[PDB]
């Protein structure tokens, strides 16, 4: 038993990080294949990033401008190209520790592991969540930046995040691997505004049912409520709505533990209205969602890789 | 900015984790050169556990017995020994994997990362700190023992933990590497006394500076306190009391906020006797303690 934030293992990543360095700036790359992944702003200066044209300054930049290196070993970059935000750097050698990977846009609610580094060293590992609002509350300082996110499936490292940015609201933003960002934002120094961060409901009620696998069942009530009900109560405290989709996600959770998903939403609505009283629930003063349904199982039945 | 329970890069641990079987138990192994460490206690069936004579049993197994597994290789053992409540078992072959490590005992208060696994696969990473009363508030499922706590200096990793059991009270309990149990634990199935569970001072007080680094300031207020008035309030709230090489530890921080220790101590003062009005900080609506001062160090100047 026990109940922890717990990241994926991160050795097939570790295998693939790389220092990038182009001028001043210095961040992080993912070196998969003969080809290595950073964000393009790597090519600015800071005057560079309140308004860059990035057509035009890519165009100025040579395969040698780009140190790339990996631990000891420099590679040779023998070409350059620009895949929306993110710059795929060629290089002359297959990275021998690539794993089997893909390149996945994950939705917002959903998790990944973040090997976050500094100058192509792996630093440390957390699980986090993209937000509602496409952010992530990470934890990135400068050069941090280049860092990814990624699942594990079985054998298959699924790459889902690459960090681009701090917002002046102290929250991070970033692209997948395609280099789309998440979200509206965009790689430039000017004040974007993130939208309103609700809280995600179907992972709440996700670690409500780990908690009471766990025995802690104090909050269990003896109402119930429906899906409309509920969701009236979720949006005054700015929850994401509950769909029957999101409730049918929980039904093995459900069927373990003996609770119909409505009789816990019914729990978390008194919750929401009433608080905690000074409580906690898996040694948390207030209600955690950043774990999926997936994630609950996944830490319950005990799946490896 | 931003702040996160941040563990380390478990990649070089990964490479040393195995699959130990004897009789029906199967449980993870530590494999540093020619030698695979793990719990004695899988050499125990269930009823053993209730009251095991660990010479008598070890007694009856020999080297055929233990079932090695690394990935698919099977490690020929041509050995085994016991060293207080961990079995070492020579296999014929040195690990490649194995990087730089060492032995350590850490003190209560301490942080590590656990790789969590079952039959010698990992299944994830988290940051764990040791109690002042031994245990650790952890996460392991049936098949978890064996599963070790490290640290990772540069290049060098410092074993420091391996999980043997859970205790009535749904906490963990382990030894060190050398096979001694952190606290007073035993590797039998009985009710064992875990002991009053005090928060870690120097931790709480770390992590109000790392939240002032971060911009969140509300808590800091006009007061200052004394080591011994501050200890007075902490001895009543179950706090670790707060010692002069505590504060020294904490000078790094205090240099880079402006903020003096002891003006920090005031602060945690008036949240312990006022609580935090529904409020969060970090966060978080309670104090954490399981960041070291070299934790929120490591974190704020970007240490790889």
Redo the contacts between chains.
């Keep these: 038993?026990?109940?922890?934030?717990?990241?994926?293992?991160?050795?097939?990543v570790?295998?693939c990080m790389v220092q990038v360095t182009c001028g001043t700036t210095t961040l992080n790359g993912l070196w998969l294949d003969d080809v290595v992944y950073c964000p393009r702003h790597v090519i600015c200066t800071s005057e560079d990033m309140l308004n860059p044209n990035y057509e035009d300054l890519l165009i100025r930049k040579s395969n040698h401008n780009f140190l790339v290196q990996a631990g000891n070993v420099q590679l040779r970059v023998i070409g350059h190209s620009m895949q929306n935000c993110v710059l795929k750097l060629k290089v002359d050698t297959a990275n021998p520790k690539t794993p089997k990977y893909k390149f996945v846009r994950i939705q917002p609610g959903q998790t990944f592991s973040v090997?976050?580094?500094?100058?192509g060293?792996?630093?440390?590992?957390?699980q986090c969540a993209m937000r509602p609002n496409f952010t992530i509350?990470?934890?990135?300082?400068?050069?941090?930046c280049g860092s990814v996110g990624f699942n594990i499936d079985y054998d298959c490292v699924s790459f889902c995040y690459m960090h681009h940015m701090?917002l002046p609201t102290?929250?991070?933003a970033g692209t997948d691997l395609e280099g789309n960002f998440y979200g509206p934002f965009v790689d430039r120094q000017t004040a974007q505004a993130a939208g309103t961060d609700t809280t995600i409901t179907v992972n709440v009620l996700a670690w409500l049912y780990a908690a009471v696998i766990?025995?802690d069942r104090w909050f269990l009530n003896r109402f119930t409520t429906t899906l409309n009900d509920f969701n009236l109560v979720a949006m005054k405290y700015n929850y994401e709505p509950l769909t029957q989709d999101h409730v049918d996600i929980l039904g093995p959770l459900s069927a373990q533990t003996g609770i119909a998903v409505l009789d816990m939403c019914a729990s978390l609505k008194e919750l929401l209205q009433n608080?905690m009283n000074?409580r906690?629930i898996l040694?948390?003063?207030?209600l955690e969602d950043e774990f999926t349904p997936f994630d609950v199982v996944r830490?319950?039945s005990?799946?490896?890789?």
């Design positions: 038993s026990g109940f922890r934030k717990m990241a994926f293992p991160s050795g097939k570790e295998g090997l976050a580094c500094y100058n060293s792996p630093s440390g590992v957390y509350k990470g934890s990135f300082l400068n050069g941090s701090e102290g929250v991070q766990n025995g608080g000074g906690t040694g948390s003063a207030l830490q319950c005990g799946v490896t890789f």
